[PDB]
Nucleic acid binder design. Structure first.
Ligand SMILES: NCCC[C@H](N)CC(=O)NCCC[C@H](N)CC(=O)NCCC[C@H](N)CC(=O)N[C@@H]1[C@H](O)[C@@H](OC(N)=O)[C@@H](CO)O[C@H]1NC1=N[C@@H]2C(=O)NC[C@@H](O)[C@H]2N1
Length: 155
RNA sequence: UAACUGAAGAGUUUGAUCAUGGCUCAGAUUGAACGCUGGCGGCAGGCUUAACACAUGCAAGUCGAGCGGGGGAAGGUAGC
């Protein structure tokens, strides 16, 4: 299980006499062969925040059906004001994406992809959109099963 | 055989936050200019502004097998 730390931020809460500071961490875990998840953690210190984020990421996982080491088809997804577009690429291309998309894709095991963000680039929302797109991407076997055809018929 | 295959973001409004939205940055390119410095070769390029005014030299001649004249050099014969 490879673990990646997308972002760490300091947040404040106002009380009488001053401010209480805390830290938030966003993490993505993945096996690298089709299983990936993400989570967030809040704590008064960075190590505890990262630990909580990793535990939440392990509790929130999905399974992704890749075509080799790339996507099955182009994907459009969005969460809130963040929109993402991902497209399969040939061998040797690599992962052409921003940091937030790159964490999720590398954790899921995608090796060749072209990706783009439109709208807001907030890390949590971008991770949400990429996660949803990867979850909703389909495969020829599922398409054939749902249509009642064969894979060769589907083409 | 081959004639293409292609898309990354970041900073900044607030005590935190998300969104909106400008401004700024990372790239490629140039008939460039300026500052510091400067060994060689190959191949290119070189008034983007005053279609402003121009000294001087050169950048369109050739034909005597179209024609009549006119020149000045070599020869020969005759006298001395
Ligand atoms: N919001 C607070 C509302 C407060 C409001 N005052 C309440 C009120 O007044 N009346 C109550 C009326 C409630 C209404 N009838 C039901 C309703 O809201 N239906 C719509 C919401 C569906 C559902 N409920 C929420 C949901 O499934 N979220 C998931 C979730 O976050 C996460 O997936 C998981 N599994 O964790 C993520 C992937 O990471 O995908 C999100 N999905 C999505 N993201 C996308 C996005 O944004 N756009 C486009 C599309 O793609 C979206 N789908």
């Amino acid at each position: 299980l490879v673990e990646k730390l997308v972002a760490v931020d300091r947040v404040a809460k106002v009380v009488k006499g001053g401010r209480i500071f805390s830290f938030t961490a966003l993490t993505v875990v993945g096996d690298g062969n089709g299983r990936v998840g993400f989570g967030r953690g809040k704590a008064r210190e960075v190590p505890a925040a990262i630990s909580k984020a990793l535990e939440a990421a392990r509790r929130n996982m999905i399974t992704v059906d890749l075509a080799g080491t790339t996507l099955q088809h182009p994907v459009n997804a969005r969460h809130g004001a963040s929109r993402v577009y991902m497209q399969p690429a040939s061998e040797g291309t690599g992962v052409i994406a921003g940091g937030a998309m790159r964490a999720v894709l590398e954790a899921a095991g995608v090796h060749n992809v072209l990706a783009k963000c439109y709208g807001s680039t907030n890390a949590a929302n971008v991770v949400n959109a990429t996660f949803k797109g990867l979850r909703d991407m389909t495969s020829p076997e599922k398409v054939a099963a749902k249509r009642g055809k064969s894979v060769e018929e589907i083409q």
